[PDB]
């Protein structure tokens, strides 16, 4: 039922209110999602000035309902089955040898637009570390996002590690722990164990003077083998 809302190109709005080590900031984004190709296209702007953390650290927080689920796997697509009422998405993100983010978000339709509204808090970050020191390269890597059912909470549990490339050639690990639960009480699809192959490419608009990020993503579900 919710899958029918994703057959074409769907407009997207994102809003994030954040606080990291006492530094408050806000981000807004807009673009388009096309689940038949598993494709996202979005542009984000820091509306409060300069972003106090690197843009790559915000990518996972800033709509997995746009993943392409092949035909033989449509029964495992929790994210679309919760639409239009939506779902709550919560994470803790541990940056190894540094602070952590905690996030709470709701993803839902407001008529024709899919909306992702987020609150973010970061604590215990080192003032001269990779995050507050802005030592991350402006890029992104490919990752497998592992998904299993959470029958007791009628949702899913998700985990994965993100590799952030640092300028000096090393990497910074970010360990993601994730839970999703529906907002409505209608029936939802609880998946078998599978994964999302996720790719992300970051760019800049040379016409944009504000602190911003241009983002393209390709996501496809896998792990059943027909």
């Amino acid at each position: 039922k919710g899958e029918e809302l994703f057959t074409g190109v769907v407009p997207i709005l994102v809003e994030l209110d954040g606080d990291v080590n006492g530094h408050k900031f806000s981000v807004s984004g807009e673009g388009e999602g096309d689940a038949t190709y598993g494709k996202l296209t979005l542009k984000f702007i820091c509306t409060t000035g300069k972003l106090p953390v690197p843009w790559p650290t915000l990518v996972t927080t800033l709509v997995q309902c746009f993943s392409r689920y092949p035909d033989h796997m449509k029964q495992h697509d929790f994210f679309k089955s919760a639409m239009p009422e939506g779902y709550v998405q919560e994470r803790t993100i541990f940056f190894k040898d540094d602070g952590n983010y905690k996030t709470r978000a709701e993803v839902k339709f407001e008529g024709d637009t899919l909306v992702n509204r987020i609150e973010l808090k970061g604590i215990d970050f080192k003032e001269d570390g990779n995050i507050l020191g802005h030592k991350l390269e402006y890029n992104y890597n490919s990752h497998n996002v592992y998904i299993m059912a959470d029958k007791q909470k009628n949702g899913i549990k998700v985990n994965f590690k993100i590799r952030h490339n640092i300028e000096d050639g090393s990497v910074q690990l970010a360990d993601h722990y994730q839970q999703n639960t529906p907002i409505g009480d209608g029936p939802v699809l609880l998946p078998d164990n599978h994964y999302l192959s996720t790719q992300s490419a970051l760019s800049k608009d040379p016409n944009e003077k504000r602190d911003h990020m241009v983002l393209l993503e390709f996501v496809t579900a896998a792990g059943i083998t027909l």
Binding site: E85, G86, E110, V115
Partner: protein
């Protein structure tokens, strides 16, 4: 949960105007839309207006489009109903509502599609 407090009712002559207001408190982070409905004694609930929370798109009940305007303030978490060209058939208790579930827009025309409702304020037109 969410709590809603309406105000601005009264007794006005036909052709005049009123402005209702509602203050929301509680888990307003989750709000996807707010609206108004009305109930006259003996009669059933009728849909008045709704506004989508992020973008501010508006919809109206058939006898009110043109005369009434719904608006909302996200920093103050309020929603108002300007009522012009009032008629005696607008006499009713007016209730403000809020929704947290997402929706397709036509879901909002259904008067019982809210998640929370306020206490109500009386409007009388003579």
């Amino acid at each position: 949960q969410v709590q809603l407090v309406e105000s601005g009712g009264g007794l006005v002559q036909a052709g005049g105007s009123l402005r209702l207001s509602c203050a929301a408190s509680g888990r307003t982070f989750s709000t996807s839309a707010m609206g108004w409905f009305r109930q006259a004694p003996g009669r059933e609930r009728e849909f008045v207006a709704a506004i989508t929370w992020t973008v501010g798109n508006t919809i109206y009940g058939d006898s009110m489009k043109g005369r009434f305007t719904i608006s909302r303030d996200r920093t103050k978490n309020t929603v108002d109903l300007q009522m012009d060209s009032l008629k005696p058939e607008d006499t009713a208790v007016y209730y403000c509502t809020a929704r947290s579930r997402g929706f397709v827009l036509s879901d909002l025309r259904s008067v019982d599609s809210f998640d929370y409702k306020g206490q109500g304020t009386q409007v009388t037109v003579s």
